[PDB]
Design a protein around this ligand. Structure first.
Ligand SMILES: *[C@@H]1O[C@H](CO)[C@@H](O[C@@H]2O[C@H](CO)[C@@H](O[C@@H]3O[C@H](CO[C@H]4O[C@H](CO[C@H]5O[C@H](CO)[C@@H](O)[C@H](O)[C@@H]5O)[C@@H](O)[C@H](O[C@H]5O[C@H](CO)[C@@H](O)[C@H](O)[C@@H]5O[C@H]5O[C@H](CO)[C@@H](O)[C@H](O)[C@@H]5O)[C@@H]4O)[C@@H](O)[C@H](O[C@H]4O[C@H](CO)[C@@H](O)[C@H](O)[C@@H]4O[C@H]4O[C@H](CO)[C@@H](O)[C@H](O)[C@@H]4O)[C@@H]3O)[C@H](O)[C@H]2NC(C)=O)[C@H](O)[C@H]1NC(C)=O
Ligand SMILES: O=C(/C=C/c1ccc(OC(F)(F)F)cc1)N1CC[C@@H]2CN(C(=O)NCc3cnn[nH]3)C[C@@H]2CC1
Ligand SMILES: [Ca+2]
Ligand SMILES: [Zn+2]
Ligand SMILES: [Zn+2]
Length: 805
């Protein structure tokens, strides 16, 4: 209940909030039914259209009009956007040639270039090209501004998570908005689209741009707009705010459009009925740029044209039903659609077993159009686990399909488009264009993740970003002028460089190796290998930096080089270069069980084979593969206890294929590759490395910890006519984070040869170097000829393995 006996007289779209019970006059008031009685009358005029006609120029002012064509309207800052064109014989913004904007042309009293964020729902990346013929205003922005072919959203590819990630730079798991619909088990409440619960502040974490602005003395226009407020009014409101005196005037503005998402659901992504929605966006953009030209701001303001996600062909008939897999369907709640989330219907039931739910959903039909995971087993690049609002059980749904619980939920067909799938899917990609004095001229940039923009928008506004998941500096190549020069973090732990300190007989590991067969030329030469005489062949980008306090040793060998952790009893990283000319060999008969002690590292800081024998679930593998040894002699180095890592047999299949076939293959395709591999420990699935006392799993009867994942970073020359190990120019990279899992239930073809399923699993588990840095606490690419900004961009790249957009 609100007494709304006040008035909006003089308060149309006031910027600060007066609380209950006094009536409101802001673009939010409708959503509370707390607008003053006269709001519609005064603040939402609609009379006489949104365009000056030839027969309205120099007219007498009449306050009841929606906009004005009167001689004094320029001053009042409330002209129609085409006032100058029709009346003063000016040309539309779109119809002028674009001159480069080498410096801000801002009128007096403007201390900084404003920022307008023009956000559009469901604007699929491929609209920029496939609709270019009917979007001339936006094609001017794109071609004269700075654009990327596409921009990658976050999972899930839904509106709320993506809009709030754009405003926070945070992953959904961090900011809290993990779906359009949500249940919080601590709150005992649901977050929905229709309803008022979504308004409470307790859902929203992190610090969005407008709060970041306000707290640092930069005033902001409001971001939310009510559904009923038409777009034309929204633009005039932004143009009026810009007329406000210097000390009242916001520096950052936002506009939003429900289109083209709204129509895309009805007609699909490319239905013929989509041309019209696109025409209207362009028209709206036209009114803004025309209106800015009127205020002498068109070479002063920076404009961001950005979408939240794309759109895919989806229909009712393409629905999987859980009622055809489970018998016990009324014992679960599903959050359905382009992604599934399952939980117990009642927490009062003791016999609710997720192991058995996943069983019944795994590879149960050759058709199957979805795949269950436990959230911690999701690809780490999705960063979709670390929140109480995300249910333990998750369904990754195939592009073009839906998941529902029972058939009745789907009839008690209409739609032809939807969105929400995995964020590396082409149809889900969206747009970025930046145009203005601070952005670059006629410049294309590589695709980037939307988590990066918060940082840039803070830069555009001279703000200091709140802690976020962007990598600040990685988008400096978008900007004409930078206020952030990124600097490399300092190494926390310096290594030990141990020599030969131990005799064989001091080791009691229970490990045998047949290696007792017997020169000054080639015996002087392999000591040199252990001092690192070939370290600049196998360690091309300097040693990783350890960014935490720990104790580790650098170990040199002929073929490879490692940083060995005395705490975790295995390498943090292993580095080696495989040239194009290198040859694959096999593990000879006599060395199949061979595990040699390392005489640089004490018995007490080593693994032992006895644990592996006694633990019937856990086998072992090697980080540097014996298969790629340079010679029969060097192959012995690969069997050192200090190259050894614990591996479930099931996972040895995956790993073996990678080491035996794929590395050589990549070395052929890319003219050699540098490989760095190591373990990852993340039992708390927060995407960050775990300390010694968070380890949940050891090899039975030992202090040998068990990685939750294994990673590799594969670098080469981008100019592939140059060997990896002699690259003059920019680098090219691909990475992965394989889940270390006791089975291969994730791959429904696993009973076949490794050549059918392994490389497919690895593609799904593609990863950014930065993702690995978070999980390891290391820092790569410390010594290159390349600028640090470029290296940041390199570390944020993700190889998607998709086709061309
Ligand atoms: C992506 O980027 C983000 C952002 O950088 C990364 O996330 C950050 O990660 C940090 C490390 O995990 C984490 O630090 C915690 O913070 C704990 C308390 O923090 C509270 O305050 C936060 C700050 O808010 C303020 O923000 C601005 C400044 O930027 C200020 O101006 C304002 O005043 C703000 O208030 C606040 O964000 C945070 O809120 C979370 O919880 C709310 C609900 O309770 C949510 O609404 C909100 O969204 C946040 O939720 C996310 O984060 C929590 C983790 O806190 C997570 O569980 C949720 O799922 C969700 O994702 C807080 O209210 C602090 O207690 C922690 O310190 C403990 O650990 C240290 C370790 O050294 C100990 O030394 C210390 O003693 C302490 O231990 C205590 O706990 C032990 C057991 O738990 C116990 O035994 C012991 O005795 C102690 O009691 C630690 O510093 C940041 O909070 C987090 N920030 C954000 C925004 O999420 C993220 O890692 C990145 N991801 C990747 C993959 O890189
Ligand atoms: O005006 C806004 C916000 C504007 C905004 C602009 C810029 C932003 O960020 C930054 F500038 F920082 F980048 C952030 C927010 N609203 C109103 C409409 C509702 C209803 N609504 C829907 O109907 N979605 C359609 C849908 C439903 N299912 N899939 N799609 C989704 C919801 C969005 C929020
Ligand atoms: Ca962790
Ligand atoms: Zn959306
Ligand atoms: Zn939608």
């Amino acid at each position: 209940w609100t007494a709304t006996s006040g008035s909006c007289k003089g308060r149309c779209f006031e910027l600060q909030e007066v609380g209950p019970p006094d009536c409101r006059c802001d673009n939010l008031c409708k959503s509370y039914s707390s607008c003053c009685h006269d709001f519609d009358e005064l603040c939402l005029k609609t009379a006489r259209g949104w365009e000056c006609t030839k027969d309205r120029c120099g007219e007498v002012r009449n306050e009841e009009n929606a906009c004005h064509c009167s001689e004094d309207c320029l001053s009042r800052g409330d002209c129609c956007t085409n006032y100058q064109v029709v009346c003063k014989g000016e040309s539309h913004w779109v119809d002028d040639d674009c001159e480069e904007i080498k410096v801000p042309e801002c009128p007096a009293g403007f201390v900084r270039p404003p920022l307008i964020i023009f956000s559009v729902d469901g604007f699929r990346a491929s609209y920029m090209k496939k609709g270019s013929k009917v979007m001339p205003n936006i094609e001017k922005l794109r071609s004269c501004g700075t654009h990327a072919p596409y921009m990658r959203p976050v999972y899930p590819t839904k509106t709320f998570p993506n809009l709030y990630t754009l405003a926070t730079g945070l992953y959904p798991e961090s900011h809290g908005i993990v779906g359009n619909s949500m249940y919080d088990p601590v709150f005992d409440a649901s977050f929905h689209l229709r309803g008022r619960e979504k308004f409470n502040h307790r859902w929203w974490g992190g610090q969005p741009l407008w709060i970041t602005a306000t707290k640092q003395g930069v005033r902001a226009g409001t971001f939310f707009w009510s559904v009923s407020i038409p777009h034309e009014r929204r633009i005039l409101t932004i143009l009026q705010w810009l007329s406000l005196p210097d000390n009242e005037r916001p520096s950052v503005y936002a506009f939003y459009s429900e289109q083209p998402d709204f129509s895309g659901h009805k007609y699909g992504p490319f239905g013929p009925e989509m041309t019209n929605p696109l025409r209207e966006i362009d028209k709206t953009v036209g009114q803004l740029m025309d209106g800015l030209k009127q205020l002498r701001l068109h070479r002063c303001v920076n404009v961001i044209f950005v979408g939240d996600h794309g759109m895919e062909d989806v229909t009712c008939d393409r629905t999987e039903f859980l009622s055809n897999y489970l018998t016990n369907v009324d014992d679960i709640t599903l959050v359905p659609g382009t992604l599934g989330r399952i939980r117990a219907k009642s927490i009062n039931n003791s016999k609710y077993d997720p192991k058995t739910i996943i069983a019944a959903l795994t590879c149960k039909k050759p058709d199957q159009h979805f795949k269950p995971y436990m959230k911690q087993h999701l690809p780490k690049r999705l960063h979709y686990a670390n929140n109480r609002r995300i249910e333990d059980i998750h369904l990754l749904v195939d592009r073009r399909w839906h998941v529902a619980r029972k058939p009745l939920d789907v009839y008690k067909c209409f739609f032809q488009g939807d969105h929400g799938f995995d964020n590396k899917v082409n149809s889900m990609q969206t747009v970025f264009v930046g145009y203005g004095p601070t952005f670059k001229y006629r410049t294309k940039v590589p695709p980037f993740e939307n988590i990066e923009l918060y940082n840039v928008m803070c830069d555009l506004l001279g703000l200091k970003p709140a802690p976020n998941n962007g990598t600040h500096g990685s988008l400096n190549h978008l900007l004409r002028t930078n206020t952030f020069r990124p600097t490399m973090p300092d190494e926390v732990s310096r290594p030990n460089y141990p020599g030969i300190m131990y005799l064989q007989s001091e080791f009691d590991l229970g490990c045998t190796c047949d290696d007792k067969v017997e020169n000054k030329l080639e015996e002087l030469n392999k000591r040199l290998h252990t001092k690192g005489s070939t370290k600049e062949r196998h360690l091309l980008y300097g040693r990783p930096a350890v960014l935490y306090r720990t104790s580790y040793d650098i170990l040199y060998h002929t073929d490879f080089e490692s940083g060995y952790s005395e705490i975790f009893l295995m390498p943090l990283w292993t580095s080696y270069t495989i040239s194009k000319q290198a040859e694959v060999s096999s593990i000879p008969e006599h060395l199949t069980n061979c595990v040699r002690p390392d005489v640089r590292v004490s018995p007490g800081f080593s693994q032992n084979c006895l644990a592996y024998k006694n633990d019937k679930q856990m086998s072992y593998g090697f980080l540097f593969p014996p298969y790629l040894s340079s010679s029969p002699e060097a192959k012995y180095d690969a069997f050192l206890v200090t190259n050894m890592v614990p591996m479930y047999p099931a996972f040895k299949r995956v790993w073996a294929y990678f080491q035996r076939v794929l590395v050589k293959k990549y070395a052929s395709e890319r003219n050699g590759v540098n490989v760095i591999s190591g373990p990852i420990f993340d039992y708390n699935y927060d995407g960050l490395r775990d300390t010694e006392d968070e380890i949940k799993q050891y090899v039975e009867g030992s202090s040998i910890p068990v990685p939750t994942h294994y990673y590799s970073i594969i670098t080469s020359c981008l100019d592939f006519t140059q060997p990896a190990d002699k690259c003059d120019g920019p680098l090219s990279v691909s990475s992965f984070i394989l889940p270390h899992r006791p089975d291969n239930d994730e791959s429904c073809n696993s009973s076949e040869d490794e050549s059918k399923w392994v490389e497919e699993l690895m593609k799904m588990h593609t990863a950014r170097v930065r993702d690995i840095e978070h999980l390891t606490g290391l820092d790569f690419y410390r010594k290159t000829s390349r600028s640090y900004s470029e290296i940041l961009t390199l570390k944020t790249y993700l190889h998607t393995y998709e086709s061309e957009i």
